[PDB]
Amino acid sequence: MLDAFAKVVAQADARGEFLSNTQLDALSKMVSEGNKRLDVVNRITSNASAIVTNAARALFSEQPQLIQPGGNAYTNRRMAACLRDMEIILRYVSYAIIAGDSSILDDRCLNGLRETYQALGVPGASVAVGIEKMKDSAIAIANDPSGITTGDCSALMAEVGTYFDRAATAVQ
Amino acid sequence: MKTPITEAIAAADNQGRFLSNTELQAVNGRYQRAAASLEAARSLTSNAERLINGAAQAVYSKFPYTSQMPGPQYASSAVGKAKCARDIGYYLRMVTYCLVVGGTGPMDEYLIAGLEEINRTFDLSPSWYVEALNYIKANHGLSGQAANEANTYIDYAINALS
Ligand SMILES: *[C@@H](C)[C@H]1/C(=C/c2[nH]c(/C=C3N=C(/C=C4\NC(=O)C(CC)=C4C)C(C)=C\3CCC(=O)O)c(CCC(=O)O)c2C)NC(=O)[C@@H]1C
Ligand SMILES: *[C@H](C)[C@H]1/C(=C/C2=NC(=C\c3[nH]c(C[C@H]4NC(=O)C(C=C)=C4C)c(C)c3CCC(=O)O)/C(CCC(=O)O)=C2C)NC(=O)[C@@H]1C
């Protein structure tokens, strides 16, 4: 996989070029936003169980057929596999945030996930609902004004949002 | 490609867990060092042509036979001199890439892997490149931690050739 710095380097190498000053400036700015990026990852990680559990609870009350006998989340084995899927997506989303690039998601999420689910009979559209619930809670927690130096993280929040959206698109 | 950030991710992912404070501190470490790395990368890039030409000349001066002996492996022909300066430029470019990502990944992947086989196959002497690298180290004009960053990667290449 690649992070935002490596992505620029690989592109330049293919052309046999040294990076330009504007490319260097762009990388300096990403370094400046560094502390903010770490706060987001730390906040999401520190509240991971809550984010997953509440999203799961909300999904199951909205779609009760998922847990009735014969439903895809019925039996503890399937429920645990379901909770694990949500934790995995959240984990990969946090990796994408620290890397500043979606590639980390691609080489996994693109491991035919929508094909895998179809073959197993996992309702991809329901997983997408779970990801959307995780997205809203993760952004609220990460963007909480309390107990942090106040400043603007709007650019980061949009970036975070795009990673959840990318995951939700891939599962269906 | 390997970078301090992708390695931190790889470590977490290998253990099936979220990133821990150990990995966040490692990324913080790369961010703090980046100011010196990027100053070095900017300086080396703007002075590239001068360092490459001067480095090639330092090799020819130290090893006179390289510009006199006939043969494709030598810089005794126009094509030879052009390939020599090209090679030196590749090493300088890889150094700037390492400075940018904060690790040896670009050099490891694009240059070091296969280095021994190429040098033996085409009859290129490792010591020719060590002299070119020593020239760059002595002439980049950097100071402080930026000189430290540049030299650490230059030395990493020297060690691979020794
Ligand atoms: C948007 C995400 C919100 C926000 C962020 C914000 N954070 C800072 C400042 C700091 N954040 C850190 C935190 C870390 N540095 C680390 O090394 C690690 C990993 C080990 C973490 C978790 C640090 C040290 C700073 C600087 C010191 C400080 O406490 O201020 C800022 C200020 C800008 C800056 O880079 O200093 C901001 C804006 N602030 C918000 O209002 C958002 C909710
Ligand atoms: C919860 C919101 C879901 C639900 C989930 C189920 N997933 C099951 C199996 C399973 N899940 C994946 C997920 C996956 N996404 C990735 O990114 C990665 C890799 C990091 C993986 C592995 C896979 C590959 C599989 C395959 C089998 C397995 O590993 O368990 C699953 C179990 C199916 C079964 O064994 O019968 C379920 C129940 N199901 C629900 O109803 C909701 C919507």
Ligand SMILES: *[C@H](C)[C@H]1/C(=C/c2[nH]c(/C=C3N=C(/C=C4\NC(=O)C(CC)=C4C)C(C)=C\3CCC(=O)O)c(CCC(=O)O)c2C)NC(=O)[C@@H]1C
């Ligand atoms: C210069 C210090 C001296 C020297 C150079 C010389 N090199 C070659 C040819 C090769 N050099 C490379 C090196 C690279 N190719 C890569 O892709 C990379 C990483 C990005 C590197 C470092 C390779 C693979 C070759 C062989 C293929 C090619 O021709 O490009 C030559 C010619 C050898 C030949 O047999 O034709 C020369 C002249 N020679 C000197 O005498 C200097 C001291």
